[PDB]
Design a protein around this ligand. Structure first.
Ligand code: MG
Ligand code: MG
Ligand code: MG
Ligand code: MG
Ligand code: MG
Ligand code: MG
Ligand code: MG
Ligand code: MG
Ligand code: MG
Ligand code: MG
Ligand code: MG
Ligand code: MG
Ligand code: MG
Ligand code: MG
Ligand code: MG
Ligand code: MG
Ligand code: MG
Ligand code: MG
Ligand code: MG
Ligand code: MG
Ligand code: MG
Ligand code: MG
Ligand code: MG
Ligand code: MG
Ligand code: MG
Ligand code: MG
Ligand code: MG
Lengths: 258, 71, 181, 181
RNA sequence: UAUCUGGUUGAUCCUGCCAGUAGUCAUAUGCUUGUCUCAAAGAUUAAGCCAUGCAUGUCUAAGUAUAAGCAAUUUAUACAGUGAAACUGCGAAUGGCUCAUUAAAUCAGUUAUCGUUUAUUUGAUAGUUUACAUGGUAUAACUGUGGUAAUUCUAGAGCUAAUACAUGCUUAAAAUCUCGACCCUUUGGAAGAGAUGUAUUUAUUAGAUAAAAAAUCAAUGUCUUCGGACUCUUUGAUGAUUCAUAAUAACUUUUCGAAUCGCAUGGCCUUGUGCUGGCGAUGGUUCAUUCAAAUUUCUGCCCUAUCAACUUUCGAUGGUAGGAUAGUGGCCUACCAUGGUUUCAACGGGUAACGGGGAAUAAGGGUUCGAUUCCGGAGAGGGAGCCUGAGAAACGGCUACCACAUCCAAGGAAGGCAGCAGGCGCGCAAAUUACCCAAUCCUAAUUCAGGGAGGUAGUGACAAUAAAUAACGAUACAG
RNA sequence: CGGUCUCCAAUAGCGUAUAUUGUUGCAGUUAAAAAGCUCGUAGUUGAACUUUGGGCCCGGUUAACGGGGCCUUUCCUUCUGGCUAACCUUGAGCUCUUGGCGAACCAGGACUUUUACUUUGAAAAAAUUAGAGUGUUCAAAGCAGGCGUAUUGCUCGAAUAUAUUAGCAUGGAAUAAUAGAAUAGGACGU
């Protein structure tokens, strides 16, 4: 190609969006934004294929141009705006606030939250560095740069960002015993507690995570997101609480509730 | 596939030229203007010589036998 | 272009179609079940072979294997639901003991015959293809329709059918009109 | 015409590579800019991205830094005396990085006169006396100051930034280059 | 092969043998061809040649309308509704098609950028720069005068705009560093005059630390109880850096630091068209993020040894310096050495070789296919070279040459269907030059316009699923 | 001379033509194939031996089976830092509490024979394949759907496995290699 691509085939789209393979030939290409293309949910999919509020792309555009959707407290009018992990989506006219959190299956789940919970979000500290004029700043996972961070904040820590003012309220250090959320790999969407962090200089660090059921799994550090201390998450969790459950029991409880 | 016969070698003379050069370098072991300008005999000789050397039909079976029998 | 839509063949030609004993076997199956052609028999045989090969592969696995337990249980549930496999025989070994006749009986044609709605298997076929038979509240016109245990008790003449309480068909009212005239 | 692509070269084993693709814009190269002493001529070059490069076709002044005293002054360039890569640049007086050049000595001499009050108001006397300990300098530099032309090395790339900045040779640098001269 | 049939003589058995009977897939072809769902369309190794039509344009309240445009109007004597044309901004580098070249090349997996560019999105980020607001150093559209046989050809003259082009100020305090009039000879002091944001270039400095105590030389600062004393003294990140950042001195045909636009009319009063002030759009330096790009580390390709030595004169291996590059790098230049690969198959040759995800077969090992719905690479008849732009070595952009080939008044002009249809390549053959942007998503100044991308339907049984052509009786005849 | 039939096969499908090597695991006296003989480089292959045995403890499976700890001459070493167990003791009732000593564990710096092989984990896009649920009228399929309903509405899913080699992390120490102390230029030290 002689330049950046602008089209996305449905088969090539991220699997977790759950798009019909025969509905059309192309899928919404997320525009540039806070989150990466493969780890983002465009607003069109959320409003049409998840909430079912709109029946087609044009109706989604009509909703957006009416300025009823807010992302992180800001109005967005792009159909393919890349909303992502820990993103707050507010619909005032319908009066709901949603937090984009993966389910156990590995898919963004429609999780409704209260207003007081919608007032803040969490961000994994991807980078800390001194800017121009000797002003420290922190870059989070969603591309937010916050100046004058607390000196104790380091990489791999989590910062509680208030949406209205965009300032850090609290933070969590990355240490053993902390509650973590998996954001990648086939363990995507699971929740557990840190046990040990294995370090390899010049390589990818590995973290051992133990679930509430005592099952243990190892994951690369890049896919780990600290969300609080054990038993005290700073955000409301989706149904299932990030516990992976086998297939036989899946049959079992589906029958039981049925 | 590099030197395979083409349907119309005359339509792609320049291409064939490259092949010859490549051969001359690949088999050397065995042997041993600015168009973007505001204003734009030997060149005609170059055309003639290059096109002639590029295209010379390989002598045929019957020509082989005729030469041997003449000798 | 649009993504492909998958397709598959539902029948396979036999290893030796020319065995005399075989030919007699399809003669039996077609004659007793009123099958139009041999392709129906081959289709049922192919489905049965797939089922029993899966059962054999599951048996090869060690007992208590999670894959074995899950998939064998699913297969037994499906076979019980369609009715080929009786309730008291819920083990993978008896699945290997199934036969083509078991599936053939569950066909809507044969069930219609047994229930007494038709006097011949061919009468059942013509009744089904003519939109006179309804399972539950819905009309089925396909002789190859497979009946479930729950569906078995709901087979009846369709509401729209003249035999099911609707008005007489075209021939009857035509004859009545000419007689009146 | 100029390209930086590596495919046209032979492989490490010596094989002659085949021609993978036509030349791409993102391995281009441009004609060298042989900077020469004279009245300033610079022309801009639009490069990859929105960035711009400066081409010094002619330049006769440059900002040279005397490192020992940590000072820097603008000075006219006299001429190129020695170049390590090739002597033809010395012959043609072409300005490039690492070329040894001669520069005028006046502005540095004025600065040293004023700062130390020595030759190569009470406030002035106080400052000169306070700095008197550092007055002594290398003999080699002082001899050139007497001559009026100082040896310097260009530390900028005139063909890229459009500047001919540099620094005055000292110590082992000056001794080695004097030996080569 | 298996099974089954037949022959092996005067006959019948038992062997053995022989012939025929297996299979899907693939190519071509023949006959038939009622219904429902579903879906495909290559092939002369000819990436051979194409008539005709279309396939890329785009405007919101928010850049520029005295169209001598339309329609409303005294809701305006600066404009304001809508708005052709043109300028301006963006896109056209996406998509679609084909597999010609290509044998460690592409490609798959897995690495790196402490080796570099990055329009746009997202978040931060700039009191240090006539102003109740500067010019034609200026033009289109437009008015008018014309040339040519001919084209998306254009000449002269007259006009007028900007978020075009080019210029240019106006805004706190403090601190620090220089140069320093003068007083006075001190342990000196000092009016004043300067400089400091950012961008580029160069030179130098800081960016500490495995842990504890002393004596002097020089400069020289706080303090007391005039004796001597002097504590808590500032430094982030990485496995690692000359990293981030900061500081000093200069440098620049040298940048940036808002002369822009929509809607609305709030608050102070000394009552002035005084001062102040709301919600947005568009721009702008740098950093980060995102979409990307470039190069790159390890392993992995079919046949060929009757291809055994190859590369190095004209870069082959490596060092030094420079040039160029967005940047590393023999990528190129100059000077140096003689290096580099190889029977663990280099080098050369063949390939009807784009690679892979996959497809078929098989009990397993294997064998073969993979132009073809997705990913990645290359191309637009063949070579060569380029403007623009963040992004092209672009071809539905430009320029040469080669081969073809259209118009012509013979002076000249215009070409690229391996895009969607539709033709030639034969004298023997095969989908409609159909409809639509309603869904998918893409482009724009942008909800609205555009999209042969895509969808709808039509058209040789491609490949697949279901499935009609009769059911129930009586009578008659015949063995 | 004149005059103007029966059966078999498939079935909305059917026919015709061409085409369609042994690693596991081949053979080499008499019916393919052992080179006239020896030497010999590459390549392939290559005798044995180094911690075995014994005695206890813990907790797991269905008396067998494996998983860990100690002891047996068997512990990697050194330094720094963090926390602190146990052990001594005072005092108040096995638990708190005073003051010492601080093992183990954790973290980092220093110290270091290298592979082959194998276990397990991450990674291998989607589509495809296998495969779970789902009355598309059945089916091929698709990822849909399901349940109530005067009125408002509630609700389950879109599972799971596979993928060679190479790279990464990890437990093993059987097998096959690799280095060490020999002119001691060897090891350790309060
Ligand atoms: Mg790293
Ligand atoms: Mg009816
Ligand atoms: Mg026909
Ligand atoms: Mg018919
Ligand atoms: Mg009909
Ligand atoms: Mg323009
Ligand atoms: Mg080819
Ligand atoms: Mg070759
Ligand atoms: Mg490679
Ligand atoms: Mg844009
Ligand atoms: Mg911005
Ligand atoms: Mg004019
Ligand atoms: Mg260099
Ligand atoms: Mg050279
Ligand atoms: Mg192939
Ligand atoms: Mg392919
Ligand atoms: Mg191209
Ligand atoms: Mg062509
Ligand atoms: Mg081109
Ligand atoms: Mg074209
Ligand atoms: Mg194109
Ligand atoms: Mg076409
Ligand atoms: Mg088409
Ligand atoms: Mg605008
Ligand atoms: Mg040997
Ligand atoms: Mg041995
Ligand atoms: Mg592996």
């Amino acid at each position: 190609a002689r330049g950046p691509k602008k089209h996305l085939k449905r088969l090539a789209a991220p699997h977790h969006w759950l798009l019909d393979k025969l509905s059309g030939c192309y899928a919404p290409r997320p525009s540039a934004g806070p989150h990466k293309l493969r780890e983002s949910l465009p607003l069109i999919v959320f409003l049409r294929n998840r909430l079912k509020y709109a029946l087609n792309g044009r109706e989604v555009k009509a909703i957006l141009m009416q300025r009823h959707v807010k992302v992180d407290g800001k109005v967005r009018t792009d159909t393919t705006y890349p909303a992502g992990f820990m993103d707050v989506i507010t619909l005032d006219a319908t009066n709901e606030n949603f937090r984009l959190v993966y389910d156990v299956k590995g898919r963004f789940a429609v999780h409704r939250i209260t207003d007081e919970e919608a007032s803040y979000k969490l961000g994994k500290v991807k980078k800390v560095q001194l800017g121009k004029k000797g002003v420290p700043y922190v870059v989070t996972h969603d591309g937010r740069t916050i100046r004058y961070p607390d000196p104790n904040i380091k990489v791999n820590d989590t910062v509680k960002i208030d949406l209205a003012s965009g300032k850090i309220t609290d933070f969590i250090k990355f240490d053993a015993g902390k509650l973590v959320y998996v954001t990648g790999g086939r363990n995507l969407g699971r929740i557990g507690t840190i046990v040990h962090k294995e370090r390899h200089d010049g390589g990818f660090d590995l973290v051992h995570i133990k679930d509430s059921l005592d099952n243990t799994f190892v994951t690369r550090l890049n896919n780990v997101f600290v969300i609080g201390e054990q038993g005290k998450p700073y955000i409301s969790l989706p149904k299932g609480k990030g516990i992976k459950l086998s297939i036989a029991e899946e049959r079992d409880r589906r029958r039981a509730q049925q | 596939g590099t030197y395979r016969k083409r349907f119309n070698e005359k339509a792609r003379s320049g291409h064939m030229a490259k092949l010859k050069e490549l051969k001359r370098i690949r088999n050397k072991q065995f042997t041993r203007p600015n168009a973007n300008a505001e204003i734009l005999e030997e060149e005609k000789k170059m055309k003639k010589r290059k096109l002639q050397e590029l295209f010379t039909p390989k002598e045929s079976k019957v020509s082989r036998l005729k030469k041997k029998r003449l000798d | 272009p649009r993504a492909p839509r998958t397709y598959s063949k539902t029948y396979s030609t036999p290893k030796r179609p020319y065995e005399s004993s075989r030919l007699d076997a399809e003669l039996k199956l077609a004659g007793e079940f009123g099958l139009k052609n041999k392709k129906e028999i081959y289709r049922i045989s192919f489905q049965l072979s797939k089922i029993r090969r899966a059962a054999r592969d599951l048996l090869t696995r060690d007992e208590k294997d999670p894959k074995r337990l899950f998939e064998g249980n699913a297969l037994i549930r499906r076979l019980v639901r369609v009715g080929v496999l009786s309730e008291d025989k819920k083990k993978l070994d008896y699945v290997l003991a199934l036969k083509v006749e078991d599936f053939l009986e569950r066909r809507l044609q044969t069930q219609v015959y047994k229930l007494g709605l038709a006097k011949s298997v061919h009468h059942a076929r013509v009744l089904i293809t003519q939109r006179h038979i309804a399972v539950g509240k819905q009309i089925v016109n396909i002789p190859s329709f497979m009946v479930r245990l729950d569906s078995e008790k709901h087979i009846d003449f369709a509401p729209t059918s003249p035999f099911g309480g609707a008005r007489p068909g075209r021939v009857a009212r035509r004859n009545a009109a000419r007689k009146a005239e | 015409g100029i390209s930086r692509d590596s495919r046209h070269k032979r492989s490490a084993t010596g094989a002659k590579r085949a021609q993978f693709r036509k030349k791409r814009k993102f391995e281009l190269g441009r004609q060298p800019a042989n900077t020469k002493i004279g009245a300033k001529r610079i022309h801009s070059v639009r490069t990859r991205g929105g960035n711009k490069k400066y081409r010094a076709l002619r330049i006769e002044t440059g900002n040279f830094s005397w490192a020992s005293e940590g000072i820097s002054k603008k000075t006219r360039i006299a001429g190129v005396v020695y170049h390590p890569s090739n002597n033809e640049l010395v012959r043609t007086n072409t300005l490039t990085k690492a070329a040894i050049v001669q520069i005028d000595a006046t502005p540095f001499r004025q600065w040293f006169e004023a700062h130390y009050g020595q030759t190569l108001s009470k406030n002035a006397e106080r400052k000169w006396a306070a700095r008197a300990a550092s007055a002594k300098i290398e003999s080699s530099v002082e001899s050139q100051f007497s001559a009026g032309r100082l040896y310097a090395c260009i530390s900028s790339r005139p063909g890229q930034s459009g500047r001919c900045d540099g620094y005055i040779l000292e110590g082992e640098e000056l001794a080695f280059y004097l030996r080569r001269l």
